[PDB]
């Protein structure tokens, strides 16, 4: 799954966290969003950094946004319904383990992303996605 | 070596664009932005790439308490002086110029310019492929 991703939302402290998972590696990026333009922005930034070819979502929210459709078209990203899981739950453990170390939840979110991608034994999620993309190239 | 980065500022439209360059590849990340803002940008970068040394060539970043709690937290060394980013800024700005009317917010135009810069080929890999080849090789 070189450029296959999936995009979910989770919630903490009355806020929305947008979570992209690189399916084959477990690598993740996340960001605190309001609910539209900011998902399109998130997607464009992801696509500039990694190969992003197919993004799966499991509801209709993302199919009803003209800015998200514009970003998909601009960057060549194909939006796909249906799931190609527990990191919303694994991410939230880590956020909690670290929440007291930052004022802003969003900082705690990015701390948890860091720990998730860097840990793990053999290869970590961050090393996997790079291994997966290196071989492919 | 794979974890060397250069950090600088540039400006368009009354706004500040923070730019990180992966020195060995030319790969770039940017954002419109300070103190906490740069700390956040750094923490996110380091979560995604190996970030071991960040070079800057001015004093601003050495005066931010938050920037450097982030340095400590993520294990990033902040050195003064350059080990590419100013001709980079002139490139980033040309591309921003070509797309500026394709988005409402400068933030978006900036990120489209990042995408183009990282995805295009100088045949022979793009910046995005080189930073990955460089990091793959290292393991
Ligand atoms: C075709 C196409 C394609 C793509 C497109 O996209 C868009 C579109 C959009 C659109 C709109 C609005 C907004 C947006 C972006 N919004 C997100 C931008 N970010 C900026 C910065 N902000 C971060 C922040 C803020 C405040 C404080 C901190 C902090 C901190 C901190 O870090 C730490 C690290 C370590 C430690 C120890 C400590 C710390 C600490 C301190 C502590 O916490 O203790 C960080 C967050 C937000 C985007 C369009 C539409 C168009 O344009 O046409 C479009 C079209």
TrEMBL record, chain B:
<feature type="domain" description="Integrase catalytic">
    <location>
        <begin position="1"/>
        <end position="135"/>
    </location>
</feature>
<protein>
    <recommendedName>
        <fullName>Gag-Pol polyprotein</fullName>
    </recommendedName>
</protein>
């Amino acid at each position: 799954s070189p450029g296959i991703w999936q995009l979910d939302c989770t919630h903490l402290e009355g806020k929305v966290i947008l979570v992209a998972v690189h399916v084959a590696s477990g690598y993740i990026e996340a960001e605190v969003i309001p609910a539209g333009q900011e998902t399109a922005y998130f997607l464009l930034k992801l696509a500039g950094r990694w190969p992003v070819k197919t993004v799966h979502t499991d509801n209709g929210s993302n199919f009803t946004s003209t800015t998200v459709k514009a970003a998909c078209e601009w960057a060549g990203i194909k939006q796909e319904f249906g799931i190609p899981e527990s990191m919303n739950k694994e991410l939230k453990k880590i956020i909690g383990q670290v929440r007291d170390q930052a004022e802003h939840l969003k900082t705690a979110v990015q701390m948890a992303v860091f720990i998730h991608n860097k840990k793990r034994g053999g290869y970590s999620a961050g090393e996997r996605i790079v291994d997966i993309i290196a071989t492919d190239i």
